[PDB]
Amino acid sequence: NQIDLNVTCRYAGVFHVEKNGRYSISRTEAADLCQAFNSTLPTMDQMKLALSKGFETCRYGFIEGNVVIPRIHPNAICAANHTGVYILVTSNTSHYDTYCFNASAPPEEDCTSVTDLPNSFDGPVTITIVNRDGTRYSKKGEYRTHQEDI
Ligand SMILES: O=C1Nc2ccccc2C[C@]12CCCN2
């Protein structure tokens, strides 16, 4: 009973979370997951500020109201070569990664590793936070509040 969460640097508090190495998070699971990090789904303006501080990914993820990819450098296989906060318009499917926003994080780029999941609750799952530099933090718990996500 294991969940792997890959997390990025934070940019003005905004960060990306990928679950189990594939697009696997529903909109309800995304909110619960950010809540486990004492975080919320970013607003579009919080995401635009993060982008301006250096944030970019090549993965779709939820924000409040939309599914997006923040892009700085044009890349033909990331958001069809677009720059800015790219908004997904048409998709058949419902599961993506997520973005989260922690208001207590530093104001600009924070590429230190994440060593805690402070607001998870009691549960049976081994949850492992995986940083890009390979450092890991694990704890037994749960963060999903909707049965249809479990
Ligand atoms: O592909 C990856 N992306 C990533 C992004 C952020 C955090 C943790 C990871 C895991 C890593 C790097 C090494 C192999 N898997």
Swiss-Prot record:
Coiled coil regions in record: none
Quaternary state and interactors: Interacts with PKN2. Interacts with TIAM1 and TIAM2. Interacts with HA, as well as other glycosaminoglycans, collagen, laminin, and fibronectin via its N-terminal segment. Interacts with UNC119. Interacts with PDPN (via extracellular domain); this interaction is required for PDPN-mediated directional migration and regulation of lamellipodia extension/stabilization during cell spreading and migration. Interacts with RDX, EZR and MSN (via FERM domain). Interacts with EGFR. Interacts with CD74; this complex is essential for the MIF-induced signaling cascade that results in B cell survival.
Location within or outside the cell: Cell membrane; Cell projection, Microvillus; Secreted
Role description: Cell-surface receptor that plays a role in cell-cell interactions, cell adhesion and migration, helping them to sense and respond to changes in the tissue microenvironment. Participates thereby in a wide variety of cellular functions including the activation, recirculation and homing of T-lymphocytes, hematopoiesis, inflammation and response to bacterial infection.
Stretch of the intact protein here: 23 to 171 of 778
Glycan-carrying positions: N6, N38, N81, N92, N102
Disulfide bonds: C9-C111, C34-C100, C58-C78
Protein name as catalogued: CD44 antigen
Chain positions recorded as hyaluronan binding sites: R22, R59, Y60, Y86
Domain Link, chain residue ranges per copy: 13-102
Modifications the protein undergoes after translation, according to the UniProt entry: N-glycosylated.
Tissue and organ distribution: Expressed in the intestinal epithelium.
Domain notes: The lectin-like LINK domain is responsible for hyaluronan binding.
